[PDB]
Amino acid sequence: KVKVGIIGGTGFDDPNLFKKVGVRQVTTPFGKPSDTLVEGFVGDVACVVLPRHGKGHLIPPSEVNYRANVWALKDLGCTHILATTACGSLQEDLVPGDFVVLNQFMDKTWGRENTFYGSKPDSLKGVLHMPMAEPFCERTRQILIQAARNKSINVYDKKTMDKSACIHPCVHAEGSAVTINGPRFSTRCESFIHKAMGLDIVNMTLVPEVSLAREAGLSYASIAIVTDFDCWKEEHVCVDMVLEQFRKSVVHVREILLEAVALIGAEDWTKTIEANKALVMSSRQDL
Amino acid sequence: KVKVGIIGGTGFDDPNLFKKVGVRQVTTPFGKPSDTLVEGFVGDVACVVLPRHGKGHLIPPSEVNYRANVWALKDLGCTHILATTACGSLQEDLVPGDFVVLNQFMDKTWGRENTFYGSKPDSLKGVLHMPMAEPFCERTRQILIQAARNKSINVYDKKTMDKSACIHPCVHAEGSAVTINGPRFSTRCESFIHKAMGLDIVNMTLVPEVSLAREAGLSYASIAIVTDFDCVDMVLEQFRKSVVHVREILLEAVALIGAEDWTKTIEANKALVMSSRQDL
Amino acid sequence: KVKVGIIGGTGFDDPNLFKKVGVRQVTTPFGKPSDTLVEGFVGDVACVVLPRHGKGHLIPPSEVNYRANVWALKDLGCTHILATTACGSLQEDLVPGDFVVLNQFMDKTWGRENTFYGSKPDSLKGVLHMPMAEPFCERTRQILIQAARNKSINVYDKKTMDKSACIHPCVHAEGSAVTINGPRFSTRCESFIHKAMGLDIVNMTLVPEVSLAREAGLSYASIAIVTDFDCWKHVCVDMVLEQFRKSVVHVREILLEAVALIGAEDWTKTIEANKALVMSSRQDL
C-alpha cells in the first residue's frame, strides 16, 4: 500500500494535522532526525509528520539533517513525501498568500550532506549519479494541484491562463526555487540576479531534501508558501499583518495536505514505486 | 560613546594608523582572531586595528576566522567596523587606483563559518535570519565617502553624474562585489559571466565579514582598492599610493564618526538582531 | 627530463596504456591517492597513470583526493598531466561521440580541498593566489589537438571553421566546462542557466584538479569525452555504452600520441615558467 510522510517547514513546527495515534522517536544510519515523528491516519491512509526545524524551530536550514529525515521516513515505510516551505517571491505574479507547487530549482546550497552514497564510512557504499532534470514526482505534483481544486483554492497556470486571470490567493501550477544556504537573506544584488535568471521564489530548505527523497526511491512533492520578509522596508503592524496572512496560508496548506493524502491513497502506485527503485539501481556507477 | 574597529586587508598587514597605546592578545568563543588587536586613539576617538590576514599575511581568505575577528572587536566595545579590501575590476569605469565604497555584493564563498547562531553546541542558541538587502551600514558608508571628499579625492556617483564625470582616480559612491572563495583568481570564463551579471569588482574577503558584523550589531562599511592582479612594477607603486589614500580616508572617517551621535543607530543595530531571531 | 602523468576518468578505471614497469603505492602530506600509481614508458617517454576514481570506481567526484593525486604525480617526477573526463553537452554543436580539448571553465564545486597552501597544519606554509584566466597549459592543449589530427580524427575549431564544417565525431579545439559538485546531475533549470551562460559541457571532476596542477608547477590539459546521460528521456543505454566504448578507444590513441608529441619537444623554459608562476603568486613572501 501507500504511506505519506509530511515534512512541515515554518508554520508546521508543531503539527496537528490529524488526531495523532502516538509520537515516535527513530534513529537512522545518518543521525537523529530533526524531532520525533507524529504517527496517525488520514482516513485509511497511514501518515507520518516530521517538523523540519523541530519543535521550537531551533534548527537552521543549513544544519537540518536532511539525510536522517528522509531515511527515517523511508524506514517507516513511507512511499511519498509531501513537504512545505515558506518562501519569498521573485516575480510580480507571486504575492504573499500564494502557494507554488514547485517543479524546478537552482541549487545554491553548500556544506550540507546531500547524498546517501559515497566512499566515507558514514555513507552507504557506492557512487550514485541520480538524474534530476525534472526533480519532483510529477504524479504527486498534480495531486497537490488537484487537492487545491477540491478545496476551492484558485489554481493559476501561466502557460494556460492570462496574467489578468491570476486570482489571489492562488496555487501556481509550476515554479522554480533558488535555494540559498542561509541563514541570511539575499542582498538586493543577489535577488536581482536570481530574478534575471527567471527564478520564481527563494527559500533555504528544498535542497538536498528533494534530491535525497529521490535517492531513497520516494515520490516527493513540495508546496511552497509565499510570505513577506521585508517588513524592515509601522514594523509591529507589518509583522502582525504578515503573520496573520501566513496563518491563513497555513490553514489552506493543511487543507491541501489532508486532501492530497487521501488522493494518494485512492490510486495505485505499483509501477511508479517500482520505477522509483529501478531509477536508484540504474544510477549506480560503481556497479 | 563610539569605538571604531579597523580590519586591514592586503596592504594593511602592519599598519601605523596611530601610536599604539596597548597591544592586546585575546581569543573568542569561536577561536583565535587573525592577530593581536592594537588599541589607540585617533584624536579623542578610540580605535582598534586588526590585520585580516595577520602579520606577514599568512592566513588566506577562506581560512580567516571572520567570526573571531568580529567577536573580538565586539568584545572590546567597538561600535563600528571599517574594513579595506584589494579587488580586481570587472567593469571599464572601475580602473586600477580607484576606490569603491561598496553597497552590494554577490556571495560565491563556501566552507566558511558565516554565522554566530545555530543549533550546534559551539554556536549561540537560536535561528537568526538577518535581512541583507542593503548589507552595509548606510550612515557609515556616507562617512567614508565624505572622508574621501575631505581628503581631496574625486567621488563619482553614476546615479547622478555622467560617465564623463568619472575622473580617475575616484571613489565610486556605490558598487557591487562578487566575493569568490579563492585562493585562485577567476578564469576568463568566470570573469565574463560575473561581468555580464553587472558586478563591479571581485574580491575574496567581504563575505562573511559584512554578514557577521551585522549579526554582532555593529555598523560595518568597506572601502575597496581597485588594483590589477593580471606591468608589475607600476601596479605595485599604484597600489602603494592607493594604500596611502585609504589610510587618509580611514583616519578622516574615524574623526567624522566620533563627531556625531550614534545612540539611535546603535540601538537600531541591536534591535535588528533581536527581530531577526526566528526561534523567539 | 619530461615525464607525463595521466589521470584517467570514467572509462579508464583500469587502463592498459603500456607495459607496467612498476606499480607504486605512495603517500602524500595530503593523504592517499585514488589508487596505486603505475610507472612505465610510451616509447622513450616516462609515463605515470592513475585512475581518478580508483579501481572499481568507488570514489565519487566530490571525495576524490585531488591534492594527493596531483602531489603524488609531482613527487614521481611528472612535468605534465593529461586528464580525461566524461561529460554531458550543453550546446547543439557538441554531440555524443565528440571530444573537447578544454580551455575554460566555471567552478560550481564546494567542500573540496582545492589548494596545497594555507595556515593549517595539513598545508604548505604560505598564501598562494594563482592566476587562472587561461587555466590550462596552452602548449599541452595544442599537443592534444595535434594528436587528434595525427590519429585521423576530425578537429573542429569554431573560431576558424564554419558550423557546416563541423563533422561528427570531431575534437572541439576549444570549450568551456561547468564543473558541478555532484553527485546528482543538474535540473533542467540549472542546465538552461548554464547553457544561457555560454558553457559548452558539464562535468564533475575538472576542479580543483586543474587548479592544483598549476599550483604544483605542472602543465595540465584535459580532453573531455561527450557522452549521453539523458537516456531517461533501453536501446539508448546499449547504444550510448557502445558509443562511449569507441570514444575511449580514440582517447587512448590521442593520449598515447600526445605523450610521444610531448617528448619530441624541449620544455626547459615552459617548466621554468610554471615554477616561476608559483613563486610569483606567493602573497606571504
Author numbering:
A (entry chain C): 3 to 235, 238 to 291
B (entry chain F): 3 to 232, 242 to 291
C (entry chain A): 3 to 235, 240 to 291
Q: Anything the authors wrote about it?
A:
Because the S. mansoni genome does not codify an adenosine phosphorylase, one alternative to fulfilling this activity is 5´-deoxy-5´-methylthioadenosine phosphorylase (E.C. 2.4.2.28) (MTAP). This enzyme catalyzes the reversible phosphorolysis of 5´-deoxy-5´-methylthioadenosine (MTA) to free adenine and 5´-deoxy-5´-methythioribose-1-phosphate (MTR1P). The observed overall fold of SmMTAP is similar to that of members from NP-1 family of low-molecular weight purine nucleoside phosphorylases (PNP), which consist of a central β-sheet distorted barrel surrounded by α-helices, as observed in other MTAPs from human and bacteria. Furthermore, a comparison of the KM levels reveals that S. mansoni MTAP can use adenosine with the same efficiency as MTA, which is one fundamental difference between S. mansoni and its host and reveals a potential target for schistosomiasis drug development.
No significant differences were observed between double and single mutants. Even in the double mutant structures, the position of sulphate/phosphate was conserved. SmMTAP structures displaying this SS bond also have the gate loop locked in open form. In general, residues 229–242, which comprise the catalytic residue D230 and the gate loop, are disordered in subunits without ligands. The double mutant appears to be conservative with respect to these parameters and shows a small increase in the kcat/KM parameter (1.6X), thus indicating a conservative role of this pair of residues in MTA catalysis.
